RNA sequence: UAAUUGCGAUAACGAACGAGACCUUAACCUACUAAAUAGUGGUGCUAGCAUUUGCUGGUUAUCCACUUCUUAGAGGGACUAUCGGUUUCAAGCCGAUGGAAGUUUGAGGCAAUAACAGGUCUGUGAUGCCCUUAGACGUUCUGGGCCGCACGCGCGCUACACUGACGGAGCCAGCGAGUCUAACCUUGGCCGAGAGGUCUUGGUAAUCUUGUGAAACUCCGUCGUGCUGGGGAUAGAGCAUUGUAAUUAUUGCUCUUCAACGAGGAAUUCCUAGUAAGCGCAAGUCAUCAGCUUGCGUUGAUUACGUCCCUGCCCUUUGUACACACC
């Protein structure tokens, strides 16, 4: 009775909304996808080239929704990681921005996000409901 | 109207878990999410131990909000379990009778790992002459 | 192949030039009518039980 | 004007030493012993102490 | 078990497998007994606990390392070798995976399987390092009960760590093998190879 | 669940680009045995060549092998950007290439000879056999060879 | 380890001599006496002294 | 060396052997048979069709299965 | 900083620090109580700044 | 005893510097004084899930109350307390109990008398003497040099992989800093695989960057012991950033070349609890460049609680032909 996305296991949650988006079609995967490593700190590109962008997107929808507003930058640092600079020590490297951006500009078309004051993206009521809706379905996955 | 609420806090290293305990229906949530989903994972039962060392029924009259700031992934776990095991004896201290509170004090400290006494260890400063607290840099002589 | 049980009574001192072995007085566990001097390598407290291999021997100080 | 407070009280502390030394070099034969600075709203106050204050 | 309900659900495999009996991960802490004397009061298995991870303090005084359970004293000795220091979380997960393997192999309790292991591996009598007059001889000295537990976990973990190095197996497996070959001393164990070597040297030059 | 058998459809060790590509290693990393193809390049080509990556090189019909080969020498034509390429904007013709196979040892020697003919500074370091990226040769590089 | 210094023990031989009626076996009350008949410049010394005077009392009596 | 594609007669081994062992894991298959291991993980997922084996602890580091039922 | 001038002997490191204390009080009063509040509470080493309002 | 720190023994008695006291810093305070630059509960205002009240959010102040977490003023707190085992039943040590705290509470600052042919004239518009002083050893400008490479030695960084790598997903700090007669720390919008660009923005700062959404880590997945997808050196190509200027590659990015390295000989370093180790982060340097240093916090253990066997220093004794003091 009354389920938020914060009532759902995250990995179970984002695993599902991704699916929800590849069996909805109307995301908007950019032209590359098969050639980007998500961050200049990675080494190889994402292995499930079909759905990483879906997993990515889904998390962000979840991630922006548990907040007030989060811009592209904070996403790049969030989905950045460690770079192995070779014979030199490791350090944090922010992630690709035209990946998170085309995620946040294409989330805007489907109405899961929208521009917002104080900069950045805010979860929409259309999005709030879409996430709270598919949340419950994952909750009641007990037959 | 404002409710009869209780507020305790558990600290561990640099994590400070604030707690709210009001008269309620029985929800137990840390940082806007139920206590069943605390996902450092292997230490799940850690945060459960304050529920099972007293009686799952001593919570059905209270709603427990918790929020952790600081520390790391592990220090947040011990910090929440301690803020929770302290709000139940501080709800009893003010809104119910003594002797049950000490029984609770009893079953807690019979098994205590910090639980209601804040582990005061801290990080030591690094000195000059070495990369760590006591570890000195390598000396070479000749 | 017999096996000795031996319960501690009193700590004598530390032998070995390195400080490598600690002396102790042990109650024979199954035969309280005995008490013998021994040399331990680990850290031995009172009342714990040694497991001697030769139930005679009994030597003293060490370097 | 308008400087960070962290640089302010630092930059002041620079001005004290510079003043303190200059007087310590100029006011030689007077026997000067140190200065104090009372920044007032309108006017700024330098207070010299020397055991020959007439020659100051 | 009186399935009580509160606003936040809390599972039923949770509510029951706890408030009733305070098992391990979900192993029985009762009914497991140190099958060798002397070593009791040092093989800590009478206080139960859920996870193998405690905000401990067993390095203040000298004799509080034994009030730490032998399980978490087993697990802590895993997480070593530079690239492994501090990774307690992984070791618990390895250990929970070490027990459940063992509980599958030969029934019994894994916490009794571990207990059986630590005991039949501690060297009863050791060779100390005497001056020995030049060509230093070796002087037989039987070893503390605390050290028969200590050097056990040392020998047992070293056994699994060197096992599953350039080997397909995981630690959890080689650990679950190294205990089983020590909980009934098949002499295939590395620890047992170690133990019956040390007492073998003390039994010589005495 | 890729529990499929394949009778005579699996054939270990084939030949591409004048190399000896192992069949029973994964497609992506099987190809990399060619001087000129590497992880990320061989990860992309198979993508453009409709190859089910989950497989090993021992599968893949000669269709799926000439589909890759063709794409690999002319990569620019199949949505593969010039920056993915080892030799972009040359110095002789000014176009984009991805020299492969033997061709890598080739233009590597040619280029080196290119600035060796002109007798530049970076050239001479390649003639002597030293370092070219002005690093420290005093303490390091010893053992030689 | 903990060996209290003469400046402490000097002060305990003096308060016990000059104020045996008003001293007692408890640490807490003496601490308050000390802030009366004595001027101790730092709390610790204040406590440390009173600790030693009180130690003597448990073997004086 | 090992094997990284099903030989059909290799498939005969697995269906008439895995219920022999009371512990199947990543390495279990690799050692007695000769799987690559990559096709052992799918072999595990395959062997959980209709409970040839049964789980008890499913993790990304470790596979702890048992006998049938 | 380093203790030594030049780099002789053991490498010993001092650390100097400066303690800057801020704080603020809020008041509401008309004409005479505004200029009086400024200069009647003054002391060397104390930097004072008094603010209008609004933006 | 860590201590000339003590108890006592006492031709000594009583004292001073040192040690100690002290100071900082890290810990405890539902007790005081506060808080739109820190929080929280209510509630206006509003979205979403349920609709059975509820769960989760939004709103710089809607309005009210408050100080639990926050910051720092004032004070409390511990004295190794209480009991016990001990010993001259002396200092003291050992153990249990309580306590935030019981290893000088942890860690630091300060630190006597005497000594050195220890280092610094290349920190100083600190200084004697010498040197030189217009073909300058002054100075400024152009270019080059400090890095030049058969090799010997020290500190380090990365590694040899399965307690891993790679890909996804989860996501948690503290120590810090940051723009006036100027161009700093920079969210964000757009652009770019990337590195970066362009348009605006906040901040002289508990207000903005910044919750510094750090890494290690957790998890799901791929790879499967194969010098392999472990390792990333050497090298070619191209795109960028710093700056008057990058060649002798400043750095950054993408592809490609895929080196030695399969646990390291005699040796040898460092370490006793939030310690070691692994992990990153700010700060110093800085136009640009960290594999360095000063600090910080995350994860966090095996082993000692001892000894004089080794190397040191300390006392005392004894020898002395040393006193420019076994150079
Ligand atoms: Mg991150
Ligand atoms: Mg990540
Ligand atoms: Mg690296
Ligand atoms: Mg690292
Ligand atoms: Mg340091
Ligand atoms: Mg540190
Ligand atoms: Mg290649
Ligand atoms: Mg090329
Ligand atoms: Mg004295
Ligand atoms: Mg003094
Ligand atoms: Mg407010
Ligand atoms: Mg409010
Ligand atoms: Mg206690
Ligand atoms: Mg000299
Ligand atoms: Mg210089
Ligand atoms: Mg050095
Ligand atoms: Mg790699
Ligand atoms: Mg990872
Ligand atoms: Mg390789
Ligand atoms: Mg590479
Ligand atoms: Mg820097
Ligand atoms: Mg330097
Ligand atoms: Mg003589």
TrEMBL record, chain G:
GO terms for cellular component: cytosol; ribonucleoprotein complex; ribosome. This is ES17. Belongs to the eukaryotic ribosomal protein eS17 family. Keywords: Ribonucleoprotein, Ribosomal protein. It comes from the Eukaryota. One of its GO terms (molecular function) is structural constituent of ribosome. One of its GO terms (biological process) is translation.
